From a paper:
The structure of hTMEM87A contains two distinct domains: the globular domain [termed the extracellular/luminal domain (ELD), D38-K213] containing three glycans, N62, N79, and N127, and the transmembrane domain (TMD, Y224-P473) having seven transmembrane helices (7TM). Taken together, these structural analyses suggest that [name] is a monomeric ion channel with a putative ion conduction pathway that can be opened by voltage stimulation and closed by PE. Taken together, these results suggest that [name] might be a voltage- and pH-dependent, nonselective, and inwardly rectifying cation channel.
To address the molecular mechanism of hTMEM87A as a voltage-dependent cation channel, we determined the structure of hTMEM87A at an overall resolution of 3.1 Å using single-particle cryo-EM in the detergent condition. In the final density maps, we reliably assigned most of the side chains (D38-P473) as well as three N-linked oligosaccharides (N62, N79, and N127), except for two loops (L148–K167 and S193–L202) and the C-terminal tail (L474-E555), probably due to their structural flexibility. Indeed, the lateral side of the central cavity of the TMD was partially sealed by PE, of which the R2-fatty acid chain fully occupied the lower hydrophobic cavity. In particular, the terminal amine of PE formed a charge-interaction with TM4 E347 and TM7 W445, and its phosphate group was coordinated by R305 and R309 of TM3, Y340 of TM4, and D371 of TM5.
Residue numbers in the entry: 38 to 146, 168 to 192, 203 to 473
Write the structure that this text describes.
């Protein structure tokens, strides 16, 4: 999300709260700037740790004024916290009481810790309340800085994973270009679209890495990035699905390229991409407009129908091909169908494990590996793409996979 916040104090109830996972030994900086001052101020701040992620997930600021009393009777959730309050006559716009040269304030759950600092990597909730007693007047700048500049926890492993994915996709592109350049006398039209898929994946990974680098080094995310990356990912997935469907039917490999075969049938699968547009951009930009179930159900049903169609077409194509005594293409089709069935089994196992580990627990006691659900799918897609690349590689006699009328 963000690490730098600018807030006009005379707005609402003057409560500013945020809950997120933070590193150990991270500092929180508060600055105040604005017009000349004439009103008494009273600033109170709470910084609370979290035993499990649940209280950071269902934390709604709209009732935060109630939440404090839940933290006042010692009847809330377990976790140590620090509190402090200070009074200022007019504005105190040049003192650094919240910056340095403070004291050692004990935490309640004999601590003697630094005033405003994290003591262990964990989910933290920070709340600040300003009371003004005798139309913007001030401006509050809030920053968080740990061992890195602005890269909080839960984003470091994702950034490393995206870097590794960028390197892997660059290697894939280099290998494909080398193989293509080595054998250019006779290629296939199916061997040109795999380069397009690799290019789209490379662009998506580069966009993600650039966005993460900018958010780390500036503290503010780029608005038109995540949406573009999601759109590119959806386009790449739709292209891969349609290529697999067209290969499964034997269009151009077993049977001749009939006039209306892909027309009105294969192209109509492009609406799947539309559904892929309703779950990517919608999920990346938090809306919560009662569309999560509508974003997950039809995509799963469409994918199941596509898998059913692909398997039936593959069975029919293999049955037809075995009757004419063909051995070169039969082994390739058997390897292709084995890879597809293994991918389906791995995907179903992954989805069962993800649904049985994360969204079944009362509160997530293991929040460290909370990023795996956003990377296992990409890793599986990359592995399947590499296997398909190894299966369909240009060679000396690159014509065994032709129709040959
Ligand atoms: C004996 C009973 C009769 C059996 C007859 C056979 C009927 C079929 C039976 C069972 C089918 C079981 C289907 C289970 C549902 C599928 C999983 C699911 O829910 O679909 C899921 C999982 O999707 C997958 O990850 C894999 C789905 C399988 C796709 C396999 C083919 C394409 C793989 C990509 C390869 C590209 C390589 C292209 C190279 C060029 C090639 C020429 C949808 O997430 P998603 O992904 O959208 O993104 C999630 C983002 N959060
Ligand atoms: C604004 O707030 C401050 C504290 O929040 C008020 O306290 C005054 O702060 C000054 C700054 O050190 C103290 O020193 C005085 O400064 C004036 C101007 O530089 C100087 O002429 C005096 O000889 C003295 O050194 C001052 O003692 C302190 N006053 C009190 C009663 O504690 C400040 O008064 C507020 N400003 C206004 C205009 O109300
Ligand atoms: C916590 O982080 C701080 C800052 O990253 C470090 O404490 C010292 O910070 C100053 C900078 O003002 C450095 O010059 C010192 O080298 C840092 N270490 C010490 C021992 O002074 C340090 O990384 C961490 N400090 C503790 C006590 O864990
Ligand atoms: C500044 O605001 C805090 C609230 O964050 C005030 O703390 C209250 O103090 C009164 C009397 O001391 C009691 O009701 C409680 O101790 C506090 N109430 C809470 C925490 O809800 C503090 O008194 C304020 N400073 C003033 C008025 O000078
Ligand atoms: C295409 C396939 C083969 C690529 C596989 C890349 C693997 C090796 C990458 C992807 C994600 C990576 C992990 C991402 C995050 C972390 C946390 C860090 O504190 C230690 C390293 C560790 C645990 C990484 C180790 C290497 C890792 C597992
Ligand atoms: C989402 C929408 C806009 C995509 C529409 C593009 C269509 C026309 C593309 C996408 C995939 C393409 C197919 C990919 C693979 C092959 C194999 C080759 O041996 C003959 C051409 C053929 C069969 C292509 C024909 C055109 C095709 C069907």
């Amino acid at each position: 999300d963000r690490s730098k916040w600018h807030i006009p104090i005379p707005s609402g109830k003057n409560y500013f709260s945020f809950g997120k996972i933070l590193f150990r030994n991270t500092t929180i900086f508060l600055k105040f700037d604005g017009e000349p001052c004439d009103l008494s101020l009273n600033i109170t701040w709470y910084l609370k740790s979290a035993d499990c992620y649940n209280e950071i997930y269902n934390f709604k600021a709209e009732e935060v004024e109630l939440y404090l009393e839940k933290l006042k009777e010692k009847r809330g959730l377990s976790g140590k916290y620090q509190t402090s309050s200070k009074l200022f006559q007019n504005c105190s716009e040049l003192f650094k009481t919240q910056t340095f040269s403070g004291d050692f304030m004990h935490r309640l759950p004999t601590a003697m810790h630094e005033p405003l600092q994290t003591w262990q990597d964990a989910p933290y909730i920070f709340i600040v309340h300003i009371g003004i007693s005798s139309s913007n007047l001030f401006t509050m700048t809030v920053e968080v800085k740990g061992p890195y500049e602005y890269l909080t926890l839960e984003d470091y492993p994702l950034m490393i994973f995206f870097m590794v994915m960028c390197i892997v996709y660059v290697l894939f592109g280099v290998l494909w270009l080398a193989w293509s350049a080595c054998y250019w006398r006779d290629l296939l039209r199916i061997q040109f679209w795999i380069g397009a898929v690799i290019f789209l994946g490379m662009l998506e990974k580069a966009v993600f890495y650039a966005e993460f680098q900018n958010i780390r080094y500036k503290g503010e995310s780029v608005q038109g990035a995540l949406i573009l990356a999601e759109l590119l990912s959806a386009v790449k997935r739709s292209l891969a699905r349609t290529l697999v469907i067209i290969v499964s039917l034997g269009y151009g490999i077993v049977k001749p390229r009939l006039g209306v075969t892909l027309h009105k049938v294969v192209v109509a699968g492009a609406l799947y991409l539309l559904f892929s547009g309703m779950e990517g951009v919608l999920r990346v930009t938090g809306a919560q407009t009662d569309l999560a179930s509508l974003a997950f159900i039809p995509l799963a049903f469409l994918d199941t129908a596509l898998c059913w169609w692909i398997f039936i077409s593959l069975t029919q194509t293999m049955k037809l091909l075995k009757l004419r005594r063909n051995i070169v293409k039969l082994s390739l089709y058997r390897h292709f169908t084995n890879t597809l069935i293994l991918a389906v089994a791995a995907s179903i196992v992954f989805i069962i494990w993800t649904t049985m580990k994360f969204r079944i627990v009362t509160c997530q006691s293991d929040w460290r590996e909370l990023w795996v659900d956003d990377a296992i799918w990409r890793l599986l897609f990359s592995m399947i793409l590499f296997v398909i690349m190894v299966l369909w590689r240009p060679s000396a006699n690159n014509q065994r996979f032709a129709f040959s009328p």
